[PDB]
Amino acid sequence: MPHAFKPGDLVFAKMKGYPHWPARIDDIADGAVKPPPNKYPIFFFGTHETAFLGPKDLFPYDKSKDKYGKPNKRKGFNEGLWEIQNNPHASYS
Numbered sequence: 001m002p003h004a005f006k007p008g009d010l011v012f013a014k015m016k017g018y019p020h021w022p023a024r025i026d027d028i029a030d031g032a033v034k035p036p037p038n039k040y041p042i043f044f045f046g047t048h049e050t051a052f053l054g055p056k057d058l059f060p061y062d063k064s065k066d067k068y069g070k071p072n073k074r075k076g077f078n079e080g081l082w083e084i085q086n087n088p089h090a091s092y093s
Contacts, residue, residue: 005025005055005058007025007026007027008024008025009024009060010022010024010084011023011024011025011042011059011064012058012064012069013044013057013058014053014059015051015057018074019068019072019077020064020068021044021046021047022044022061022080022081023044023080024043024045024089025042026040026041026042027041036052038054039054040055040058042058045076045081045083045084045088045092046076046080046081046083047076048076061084
């Protein structure tokens with residue numbers, strides 16, 4: 001049975017105006033800015049952008065990859081697909 005999201009979890013994350021996007025739940029570094037209440041820091045593969053999202057916009061990667069894990073024209077998407085499949089827990093700084 002599902003637990004709550006934790007850092008390291010792999011997801012497709014949904015933002016308005018963008019397709020469901022390969023992403024992970026990030027850690028917050030010591031001394032780094034904390035997310036709002038009820039939000040997680042999402043790192044987006046490919047773009048390497050960070051946004052703060054709640055669970056309504058987070059789809060677990062394994063369940064969802066057959067639906068959302070196809071190439072897309074958008075900038076950074078295909079790079080993002082390689083990262084989440086090939087090295088999802090790497091430093092992308």
